[PDB]
């Protein structure tokens, strides 16, 4: 026999979204009468009007209440229920994750290692410590839509409780900058060519998806135990059908020495500005992780670049890789190659080595 749905605890209800932030509820409630329950404990019934809920009212439990309301079609306001809105397939309960030690940090806070309890899969877990707080789930919205060998995979989103997490594949060899600086001296150029080709494949993929990453750098690339490179940190990334993200107004956090002149000074972000950052990533790679413009401040770099200044060819960087960098740093965005062009050229270079 079956336990009735309404007899199940609130925790188990498809229409209970726990720590769902404001902007999501907005996004989730489509038609008149659509509803969910969430925690504010004070539970809240969001039909977008928000009704605050040992018996619950506006019964022994909140599913008992919700069913009564639906069944009877009596009002809460005038507002009446039509259809409970379920969680999407990506929502994971906190208890399905075993949190491990911190492996990094960013603006929202720590990244941790973890495991999935059900099958021991190792994972990375981005946590969020409130306007910026509203931007946190951006990386999840973006990554839900993708699946590519050189892009970090989304596994799930823990929005049922605080603190909120975004759960991703763990790429166990760590960031590519540390990798270059720690293993680079034993690395063959052919391996380096493969790894920057991985990065180009990932970026070509992002451009096909109308995604503009905005923080491409060795520090935001990750290396598998087999030296496959995956692009990570999609926190600043934006999706634009028409291909340009226009910075919205207000202070911005800018990785100056990886940022194209037009993105920096006019706030025009595009796959073409991403190509500039790729140019810099190529430089980081074939320098075995040197810091770019090492004797210039950020301000001095902006001036040097505006005057036609560019990074020097790293020693023993193959000539065709440096020509490719140079092209990536063309001043006019229109003059830079596509990621398609870059990936093909890198594969061609690699094949010849």
């Amino acid at each position: 026999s079956m336990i009735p749905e309404v007899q199940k605890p609130l925790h188990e209800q498809l229409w209970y979204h726990g720590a769902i932030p404001r902007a999501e509820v907005a996004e989730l409630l489509v038609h008149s009468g659509d509803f969910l329950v969430r925690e504010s404990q004070e539970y809240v019934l969001s039909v977008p009007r928000h009704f605050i809920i040992n018996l619950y009212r506006l019964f022994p439990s909140i599913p008992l209440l919700i069913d009564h309301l639906l069944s009877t079609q009596q009002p809460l306001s005038g507002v009446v229920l039509h259809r409970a809105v379920p969680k999407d397939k990506w929502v994971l309960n906190h208890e399905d994750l075993v949190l491990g030690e911190q492996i990094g940090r960013g603006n929202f806070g720590e990244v941790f290692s973890g495991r999935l309890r059900a099958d021991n899969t190792l994972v990375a877990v981005k946590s969020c410590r409130p306007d910026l707080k509203a931007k946190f789930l951006q990386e999840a919205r973006i990554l839900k839509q993708y699946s590519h060998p050189n892009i970090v995979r989304l596994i799930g989103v823990c929005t049922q409780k605080q603190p909120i997490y975004i759960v991703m594949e763990l790429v166990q060899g760590g960031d590519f900058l540390t990798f270059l600086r720690t293993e680079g001296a034993r690395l063959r150029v052919k391996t380096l060519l493969q790894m920057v080709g991985d990065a180009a494949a990932g970026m070509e993929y992002l451009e096909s998806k109308c995604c503009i990453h905005r923080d491409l750098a060795a520090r935001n690339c990750l290396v598998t135990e087999k030296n496959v490179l995956k692009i990570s940190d999609f926190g600043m990334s934006r999706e634009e059908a028409d291909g340009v993200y226009a910075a919205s107004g207000g202070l911005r956090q800018v990785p100056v020495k990886w940022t194209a002149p037009e993105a920096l000074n006019y706030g025009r972000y595009s796959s073409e500005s991403d190509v500039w950052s790729f140019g810099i990533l190529l430089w980081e790679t074939f320098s075995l992780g040197a810091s770019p413009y090492p004797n210039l401040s950020n301000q001095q770099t902006r001036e040097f670049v505006e005057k036609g200044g560019r990074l020097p060819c790293p020693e023993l960087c193959p000539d065709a890789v440096f020509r490719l960098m140079e092209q990536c740093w063309a001043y006019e965005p229109g003059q830079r190659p596509s990621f398609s062009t870059i990936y093909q050229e890198l594969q061609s270079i690699r094949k010849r080595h």
């Binding site: 750098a217 202070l251 911005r252 956090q253 800018v254 990785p255 020495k257 990886w258």
Partner: peptide
């Protein structure tokens, strides 16, 4: 690396 601008 990052500048608030």
């Amino acid at each position: 690396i990052y500048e608030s601008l």
